[PDB]
């Protein structure tokens, strides 16, 4: 097969390629932080990195972070409007390869 948009002689990659955005919350949502212990997302991210950075690929580590935040945390507020709320981190990957912090 042949076409007008593939197999260029000069190899190029998108200027937006190889970026990874690890968002603490879903698009359009508030993000929660415990005034004493820190944000749910960063707390969880550090915990998962400390436990799995030498064992799992980065996306899988972030998936564990997603699960930790989603299941273990629920807001507490004297304002009923902000009480008992949940949060799900959001992994946005434009990476082109697997990423392991070890080799």
């Amino acid at each position: 097969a042949s076409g007008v948009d593939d197999d260029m002689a000069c190899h190029k990659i998108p200027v937006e390629a190889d970026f990874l955005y690890a968002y603490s919350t879903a698009p359009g949502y508030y993000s929660w932080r415990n005034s004493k212990d820190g944000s749910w997302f960063i707390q969880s991210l550090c915990a998962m990195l400390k436990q799995y950075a030498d064992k799992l690929e980065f996306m899988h580590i972030l998936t564990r972070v997603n699960r930790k935040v989603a299941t273990e945390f629920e807001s507490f507020s004297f304002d009923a409007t902000f009480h008992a709320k949940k949060q799900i981190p959001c992994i946005v990957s434009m990476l082109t390869k697997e990423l392991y912090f070890y080799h």
Partner: protein, 146 residues
């Protein structure tokens, strides 16, 4: 040599790379934004976590929107040739696509553009990670019982 697959980023360069942490806890009264209690705990946790991963961690506290852009521009202009990757952690108030400096907002796009494949050649082909702790809107998740 034998079969080569190239399915994972080369992470064995001399240096793992930089881990820039922007920790905004106190904001100018002029903005009406409240302090972010507990953020220092996050900042410290991140410094230790990435230190153990062998990253060159650099922390900055309470940066104005101008200082955030200047920091990102300067860092992007460094020679990352011997570095495997780049990490930036943003801790502050925010809205969709925005991170707040102590005196006003900064488009996340302006920050990440400095690291585009064509603008930071020493990072082309290398993973650029942006970890963001900030709101992305005003919706609340009521959750569901399982």
């Amino acid at each position: 040599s034998g079969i080569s697959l190239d399915n994972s980023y080369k992470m064995d360069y001399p240096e793992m790379g930089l881990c820039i942490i922007i920790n905004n806890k106190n904001f100018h009264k002029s903005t009406g934004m409240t302090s972010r209690s507990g953020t220092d705990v996050d900042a410290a946790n991140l410094r230790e976590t990435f230190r153990n991963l062998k990253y060159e961690v650099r922390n900055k506290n309470d940066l104005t929107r101008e200082e955030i852009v200047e920091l990102m521009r300067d860092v992007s202009k460094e020679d990352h040739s011997k570095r495997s990757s780049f990490v930036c952690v943003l801790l502050s108030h925010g809205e969709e696509g925005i991170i707040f400096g102590t005196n006003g907002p900064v488009d996340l796009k302006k920050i990440t553009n400095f690291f585009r494949g064509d603008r930071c050649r020493s990072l082309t082909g290398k993973p650029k990670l942006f970890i963001i702790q900030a709101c992305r809107g005003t919706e609340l998740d009521c959750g569901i019982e399982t």
